[PDB]
C-alpha cells in the first residue's frame, strides 16, 4: 500500500519518490529459491520521520525527498536500522 504514485506515506515522503513527469513503473517481486545469488539483509528498514528543528528550538519542518534523490537524512540513518523505533540526531552548524 505504501509504495504507490498515489501514496502519501513515509515512503514517497522520506524514502523514494519517482518522476511525475515521465512514464513510470513500480514492480514488487520475490526472489524464489531458484536463484540463490541475491542475499537477504537482517530486516527491511525504512525512514519514518525526517525533520529539521529550526534554531528557535520550537518549529519542526519535515524534509521531503525529491524525485530522483536521496533523503537528506541518509547522512544520519544507518544502512540497516537496529531496532524498530530508533531515532537519530545531528546538530547543524550555523551556516548549515
Amino acid at each position: 500500500s505504501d509504495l504507490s504514485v498515489s501514496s502519501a506515506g513515509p515512503i514517497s515522503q522520506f524514502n523514494y519518490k519517482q518522476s511525475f513527469s515521465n512514464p513510470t513503473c513500480l514492480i514488487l517481486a520475490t526472489v524464489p529459491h531458484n536463484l540463490t545469488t541475491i542475499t537477504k539483509p537482517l530486516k527491511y528498514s525504512y525512514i519514518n520521520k525526517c525533520s529539521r528543528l529550526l534554531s528557535d528550538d520550537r518549529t519542526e519542518v519535515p524534509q521531503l525527498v525529491n524525485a530522483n534523490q536521496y533523503s537528506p537524512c541518509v547522512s544520519i540513518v544507518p544502512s540497516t536500522v537496529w531496532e524498530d523505533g530508533d531515532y537519530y540526531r545531528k546538530q547543524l552548524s550555523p551556516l548549515e
Partner: protein, 728 residues
Amino acid sequence: SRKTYTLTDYLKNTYRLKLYSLRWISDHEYLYKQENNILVFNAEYGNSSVFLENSTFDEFGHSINDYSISPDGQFILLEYNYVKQWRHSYTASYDIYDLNKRQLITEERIPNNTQWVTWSPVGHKLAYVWNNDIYVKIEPNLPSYRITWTGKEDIIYNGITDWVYEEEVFSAYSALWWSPNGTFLAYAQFNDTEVPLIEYSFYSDESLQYPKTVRVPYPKAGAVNPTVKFFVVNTDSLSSVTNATSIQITAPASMLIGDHYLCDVTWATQERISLQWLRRIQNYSVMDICDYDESSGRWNCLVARQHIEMSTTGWVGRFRPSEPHFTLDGNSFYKIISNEEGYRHICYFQIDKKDCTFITKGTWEVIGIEALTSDYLYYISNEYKGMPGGRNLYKIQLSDYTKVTCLSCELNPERCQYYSVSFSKEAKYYQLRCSGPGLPLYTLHSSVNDKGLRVLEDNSALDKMLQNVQMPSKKLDFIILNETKFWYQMILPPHFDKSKKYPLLLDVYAGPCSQKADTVFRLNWATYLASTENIIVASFDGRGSGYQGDKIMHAINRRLGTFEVEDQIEAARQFSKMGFVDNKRIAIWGWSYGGYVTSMVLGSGSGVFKCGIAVAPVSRWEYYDSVYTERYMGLPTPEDNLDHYRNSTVMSRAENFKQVEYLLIHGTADDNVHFQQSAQISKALVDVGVDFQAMWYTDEDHGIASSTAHQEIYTHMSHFIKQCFSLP
C-alpha cells in the same frame, strides 16, 4: 467524660469508616457489592437486582484476590495468586468465567505469572502482559495473539512500565491504552538497557538460607534514563496467519534532540490520538495529535496540530503536564493550564490553533476536569470561601462562561467541604463522595436537573460509636507572612483549655505541590495522640505547596531543602506565639519528603524543636530518582545546579543534631527511598559523635504497610513521643 480514642483503637481499627464504591456500567446503571454479592442498581428509578451471587465462587478452590466484570457483563475475570512486585504492580494467576454458560473457561487460559490484564472498554476483548510482552484475546476462549516478541526481564518492557515511569510518570503498572471502542490498542515500550541497577538484600522467611539480592533498574538524579517508544496496533485485523503489525508513532522533533519522556496518552475519537511528551529538563513539553489514515493503515501527526507548553519559572504541570479532554468531534479540547497570574484554570483549545482561551479565572485553582458534555463542563476546584484546602463540584456552561453553578457547596455546608465525583457513562447521573469535615457522606444525583435522588451511605453507625468517645476537635485556619496567606491545621485534644500549655507535634510533608491543611475528616494516630495523650498535632503548608498558584508553588524551584524547611520552623514559632503551646515540648515528624524536612529541621540548629522522628527520609537528592528530583532541581552537574544539590543534604547538618533527640526509621526493602539514604544519615551522625535512636524494619517497603510492621512502627513512635514529652 467517656473513654478516649486509643492507640489500640487506631491499630485494631475498632472505629471504621464505611464507604460506598460503585462502578458505572451504563448511562443509568452501576454495580455495588452489598453483602459480598454483586448487585446492579438502576438510578433512573430505584430498583436493584442480583448480578452475581456470593456463592458463585464457593467452588473455585482458590483465595480470590480480585475480580473484574467485562463492559458487556458477559464475562468475569478472576484474579488469584497475587504476589507483590512494587507499588501498583504484581504477578498473578487468572481464570475467566463465562456468565451465560455459567462455566469456567478451561481451554487457552491466561498464563500463570501474568503482569497485567485489561478488558477492552466495550466488548469482552482482553489485553494482558506476560514476560513483558503484550498478548490480545479477542474471544476469551481462543488462542491469544502475541503483539510483541521483544520483551526481556529488566530490559525491555512492552505494555507495562519500568520502575521510574510507574512511580513518577504514569502512577500505574499498565502502559496500555485502548481506543474508545477497543479497535486500537496503543502501547509503550520502555528500554532500561543502560539504566544502572539498585541492589539490596531481601531476607524473606526464616528458612531461606542465603538472602535474595533484589536488582531494580532505577535512575538516580543525573544517571542514564530509560528510553521510550510508542506503538498502536489494530486489534480488529489480527490473525494467526500473521504476526500483528504495530505502527510506531514517533515523538516530535523538539523531543528527539535529547533525553525525553512520554508523559500522557489520551484518545480523542475512535481514530484520533493525543500524545504528550516532556523534555528531561521538565521546562518544556509538546502535545502531538495523530489521525488514523484509513488507506495507508498508519498514523498521521500533522505539525501545527502540535501544541507547545513551556514554563518560565519551574516545571510544566503540577507533577506532569495535564491531560486534555476532547469534545466529541475531537477538533477542540479543554485542558488545565496555568495563567498569567500563575493560577491553574481551564483552557479551551482548537486542535489547529496555537492560542487557547481561558474559561475560568480567579485567585483559586481548578483541581480537575471531571466530565464534559456538549452543554456543560463539570470540574472540581477550591474557589468556595477562598479555602485552598476545600474541594467542590462546579459545572460551567459552554455557551456562557459566566453561567457557572455550584453543584455541592449548598448540599450540606457545615458537614461537607471536600467532594470528589464519579459520573455515569454520559454524565446522566453522578455520585458525590464527601470526605470531611464531618463524617464522609455518599449520595447520588441526576445531572439533568441536579436532583439528589438517594443517600448511599452516611456513617450513622460510626457516628453512634463516636458519640461515646472523647474525640479531638480540628481547627483549620491561616496566618499571614509577607502579605500572603499560609494555611495550617491543628488537631486539638478533648476539653481543650486555651489557657493551659500543650505539647505540640508538627506533622510534616512539605514536598512540592503538597497540602497537609485540608478539610478532610480522619481517624488516625494524630487522633490517638490528641484524644489520649493531650498533645496538639499540627500541619502547615508553607512555600512550594499546592493549589494556591505558582507564586507559592514554584517558590522552591531549583532549591529544595530551603524555603519549605524555613517555613516549617517559622510555623512552630508562630504556633508558640498563640500561647497554648509549651515551647519546651515541640516534636516534628514526617515520612519520605517529610522525613527529609524533619531531618533538615532537626539539623538546622534553630533550637525550636526538642525531638523528631524521620521515617524513610530522603537525605541527599543525588540518591533519589531522576524524574521526580530533576523536575525540581535540574541536573547535579556543575553546569546546572550541582551547588544547590550539595548544599542541601541532611548529613552536612550532623553536628547540629547534638541538640535534639532523633528517631530514624527505615524499611530494609524500600525500593523508593533506599535504605542507603538513612544508612548515610546514621553514618554521618556516628562520625560526629551524636547519639540517636534508630529502627530498621526487615523486608518492609516504603509503605511499611504490612499489618504487624505497621502496628509495631506506630507503637515504637508512640513510646518515643510519650518519653520525649515526659508524659505517663
